[PDB]
Amino acid sequence: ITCRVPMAREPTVIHGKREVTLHLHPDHPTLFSYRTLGEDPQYHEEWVTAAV
Amino acid sequence: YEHSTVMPNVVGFPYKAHIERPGYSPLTLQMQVVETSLEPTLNLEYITCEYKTVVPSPYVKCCGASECSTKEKPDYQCKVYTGVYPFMWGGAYCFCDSENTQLSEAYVDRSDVCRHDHASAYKAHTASLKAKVRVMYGNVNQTVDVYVNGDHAVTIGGTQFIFGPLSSAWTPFDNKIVVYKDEVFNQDFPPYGSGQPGRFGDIQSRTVESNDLYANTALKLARPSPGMVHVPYTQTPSGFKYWLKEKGTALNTKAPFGCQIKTNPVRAMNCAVGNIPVSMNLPDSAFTRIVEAPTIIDLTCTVATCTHSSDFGGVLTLTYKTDKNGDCSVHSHSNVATLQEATAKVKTAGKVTLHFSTASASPSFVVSLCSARATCSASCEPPKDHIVPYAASHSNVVFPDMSGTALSWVQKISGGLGAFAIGAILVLVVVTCIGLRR
Numbered sequence A: 001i002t003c004r005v006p007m008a009r010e011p012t013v014i015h016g017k018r019e020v021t022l023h024l025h026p027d028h029p030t031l032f033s034y035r036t037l038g039e040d041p042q043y044h045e046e047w048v049t050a051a052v
Numbered sequence B: 001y002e003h004s005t006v007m008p009n010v011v012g013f014p015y016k017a018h019i020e021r022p023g024y025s026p027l028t029l030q031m032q033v034v035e036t037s038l039e040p041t042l043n044l045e046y047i048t049c050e051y052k053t054v055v056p057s058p059y060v061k062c063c064g065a066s067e068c069s070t071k072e073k074p075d076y077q078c079k080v081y082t083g084v085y086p087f088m089w090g091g092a093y094c095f096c097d098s099e100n101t102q103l104s105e106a107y108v109d110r111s112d113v114c115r116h117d118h119a120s121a122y123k124a125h126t127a128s129l130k131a132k133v134r135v136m137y138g139n140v141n142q143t144v145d146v147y148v149n150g151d152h153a154v155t156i157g158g159t160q161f162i163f164g165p166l167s168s169a170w171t172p173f174d175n176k177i178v179v180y181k182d183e184v185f186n187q188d189f190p191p192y193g194s195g196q197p198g199r200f201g202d203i204q205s206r207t208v209e210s211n212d213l214y215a216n217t218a219l220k221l222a223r224p225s226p227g228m229v230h231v232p233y234t235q236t237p238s239g240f241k242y243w244l245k246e247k248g249t250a251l252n253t254k255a256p257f258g259c260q261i262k263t264n265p266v267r268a269m270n271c272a273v274g275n276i277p278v279s280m281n282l283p284d285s286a287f288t289r290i291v292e293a294p295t296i297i298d299l300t301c302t303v304a305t306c307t308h309s310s311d312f313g314g315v316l317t318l319t320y321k322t323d324k325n326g327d328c329s330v331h332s333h334s335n336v337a338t339l340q341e342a343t344a345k346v347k348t349a350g351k352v353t354l355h356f357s358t359a360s361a362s363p364s365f366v367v368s369l370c371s372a373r374a375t376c377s378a379s380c381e382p383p384k385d386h387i388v389p390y391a392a393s394h395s396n397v398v399f400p401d402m403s404g405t406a407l408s409w410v411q412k413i414s415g416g417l418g419a420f421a422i423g424a425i426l427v428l429v430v431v432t433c434i435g436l437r438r
């Protein structure tokens, strides 16, 4: 069957010189992951629980 | 007419190809890549699912001994125990205080939902490539699905196109993969018939509907407690649930080159690597004769503004004089700068404006309008916005032109030093000649 999930709040993006700063404000334990689209990627993933 | 070219394998990047033949006006072909797919050839090794332990009701014999024989079942385990006094809710079960005997057996089978939830082990081989390509020229604008193999030949508007083969045999899948739901993992698995308890592969089956099953889960039986009717057993927990607990990281969030991984069928999409060669055969009806094409003479170029950014940050203007109004095909004959429009309208006024994008401090390139050519060179300033949400629309070149300011300073310094060194050479030669004359 089809069963329902909520969309997480959009994060706060702060620009920079070849960097970004993300303010994350979770309401529930949410999974956050990121990777780079180059030759060798620097993957990362974690379970964000509190605001970080 | 036959032509051959190469295009970068970048999704969404426009490509312009120039076709020039004697007796006809030049033609510009626009080709774009909408979506690509890469699929390996898979041969199934086995599948795994959570198991269930079937235990039947124990057998009890009063004043008798019963021996149990072996059976052809997965991990069948049977045992016989002597000297038991089972109790029930009414009272004793048999008279014989110590002559009773209990037979207990257990085995393992696949779960009732193995048909719906299972993990598959695959071996990966050479991979194919399918692409969707949009082609534009004249009054033709069509998207076609092709195989990038050097085999498929498609026909668009009476024109024959052959694509491929790819120039970089690279695949993100390792030799052995494990597929579950919509995730692929690049991990190795035990061979068939050599599974170990507690980890992945505790039970294996050649296919979902196969009738043979290999299991190794340490079904050790134990003696029943006195005054009780039960069968105890110790078994290492299912390895499939453990693997689901700490499988690791999926290839979905790790694949290089921004490779979007999808399942059913296993494939990778929008993988940007290498370049695709294109061979085309054009009919003679897609060109225009020189006589009815416009004539351009005395074409000079200048740049109004430039700012090297991912967007189309540049504007150039071309001045010219003609003999009749018409439409021309324009092109840039270099890789530093990429244009935006492949066609232009030429009137008697004599001024056209074009857009372009670049990534060098000072570019220099040749721009062709119909049969006329001109040279454009200008200075650009860096942008201010640090991060943009769209991919670059310029081929990455950084080296400036030999007549740019930095290289101009380098040339002037080098020329001064070289002239001074050459003067020193000449004076030394003259002195040594006048010395040897004596």
Ligand SMILES: *[C@@H]1O[C@H](CO)[C@@H](O[C@@H]2O[C@H](CO)[C@@H](O)[C@H](O)[C@H]2NC(C)=O)[C@H](O)[C@H]1NC(C)=O
Pocket (backbone or CB within 6 Å): B063, B064, B095, B099
């Ligand atoms: C009824 O009970 C008697 C004993 O209470 C059972 O007789 C025993 O049978 C076993 C094996 O047949 C012998 O080893 C014992 O020595 C016997 N006991 C006696 C006192 O003779 C008999 O088998 C039982 N029969 C049924 C049908 O339950």
Ligand SMILES: *[C@@H]1O[C@H](CO)[C@@H](O)[C@H](O)[C@H]1NC(C)=O
Pocket (backbone or CB within 6 Å): B141, B142
């Ligand atoms: C080509 O056709 C597609 C599909 O209708 C359309 O989105 C696109 O704008 C067309 N291009 C031109 C130049 O008309």
